[PDB]
Design a protein around this ligand. Sequence first.
Ligand SMILES: CC(=O)N[C@H](CCCCN)C(=O)N[C@@H](CN[C@H](C(=O)N[C@H](Cc1ccccc1)C(N)=O)[C@H](C)O)COCc1cccnc1
Ligand SMILES: CC(=O)N[C@H](CCCCN)C(=O)N[C@@H](CN[C@H](C(=O)N[C@H](Cc1ccccc1)C(N)=O)[C@H](C)O)COCc1cccnc1
Length: 426
Amino acid sequence: GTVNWSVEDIVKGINSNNLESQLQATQAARKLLSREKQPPIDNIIRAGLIPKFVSFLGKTDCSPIQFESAWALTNIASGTSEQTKAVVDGGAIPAFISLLASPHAHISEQAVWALGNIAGDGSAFRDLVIKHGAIDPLLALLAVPDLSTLACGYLRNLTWTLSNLCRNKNPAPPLDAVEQILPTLVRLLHHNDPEVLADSCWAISYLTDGPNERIEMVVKKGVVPQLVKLLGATELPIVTPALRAIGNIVTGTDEQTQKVIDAGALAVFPSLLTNPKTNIQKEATWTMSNITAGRQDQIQQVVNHGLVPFLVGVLSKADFKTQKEAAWAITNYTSGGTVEQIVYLVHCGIIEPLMNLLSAKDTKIIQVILDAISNIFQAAEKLGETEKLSIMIEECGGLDKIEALQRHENESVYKASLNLIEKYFS
Ligand SMILES: CC(=O)N[C@H](CCCCN)C(=O)N[C@@H](CN[C@H](C(=O)N[C@H](Cc1ccccc1)C(N)=O)[C@H](C)O)COCc1cccnc1
Ligand SMILES: CC(=O)N[C@H](CCCCN)C(=O)N[C@@H](CN[C@H](C(=O)N[C@H](Cc1ccccc1)C(N)=O)[C@H](C)O)COCc1cccnc1
């Protein structure tokens, strides 16, 4: 019936002076826009149909045409930024917000989905959705005593949309909107459905991706223990944003970082640092590099949790981007650690994999590694053991790699390797 219409026939029907004819053609548009291979969005837009769809959103007397036009606009707003913009320019934002409280659940769900698509386009439209007042009615849809009585797709829909209201930067979302949304996010983070949990963790990762004041308003809600729990989930779609969020938080203050350690996060890291998914192992090592940039008593907890051999592990064999993160973790460790903490690091076998990485062509890692070697030599200086260190480095073939760094030229690299060869190695 309404299958595979041309855009011309859709236009003929929608332009008619007959509500049923308009409904039939709007449904035909919805089906065109719902096909998987190349839905003709630009053709629909060029025909001038967006304003008609938007006016149909307000037809309270005809809920099927509200539903059909809502679904059509949702699929257009899902497209390119230019196409999302056409939807906004047609006036759809307040028309959708008015539909959030519809007695028909399928229409309210459309409005949630479409507003998520619009907010999901970027910072300006996110902020414009907030200004038109979407947050209060969005949160009101979740005001039940037990989230478990809501339909599954329905709850995942609202969670996805809320996380888009948290998502982008330059600027980050308004402080007031964040504070308004956070309590609901905390509740969702405790819901038993893997998609809601994943989406909730993504939202938290967005909110922690900024300056320390932003991280603080999240940590103040008490979510770090729950995030650490999700960090140990079996589902990779949960683990990935939980680790992102956790990694964002330890970019903050030493006190914010200590909350992560206090919650038991370090115990999960033997698994994460050997995880078969490359990006999980990369972000775990990145996370370690920021914990080793903390206080000496925080470095010490890394020691007590047995994590230094795992750092030697990743430095020895990992994807190259992961190894670079491990190199950073080692330079931070040696820059902040005690003499004794540095000696332990050498006892675990850090020198050889460190030296082997001087063969890498990436200039910035070579800098980082040379810095680390310097910090370790300063430890041997206080113990009067520079010579034993030089012998270790020489025998594993490190000296040749440092020698060769001089024919290499970066102003700092060529330099740093000189100093080392003059100061030690006679
Ligand atoms: C971060 C983000 O959301 N990014 C973009 C938004 C585009 C902006 C570009 N300028 C995005 O991927 N959006 C949506 C697009 N929905 C498209 C769509 O057709 N959705 C329809 C709409 C719908 C909704 C409710 C009931 C029935 C139908 C669907 N669920 O069948 C998909 C890909 O077909 C895929 O679904 C994601 C989503 C959005 C809102 C709520 N839940 C899920
Ligand atoms: C040694 C030191 O001073 N570290 C401080 C944090 C100390 C917190 C103590 N608890 C530091 O800046 N550590 C890392 C984190 N870099 C951050 C970073 O990479 N952020 C983004 C995400 C982000 C952005 C803003 C805040 C929080 C998180 C990312 N995932 O790429 C921002 C861009 O600076 C950057 O430096 C390590 C590094 C450099 C290059 C490559 N890998 C790791």
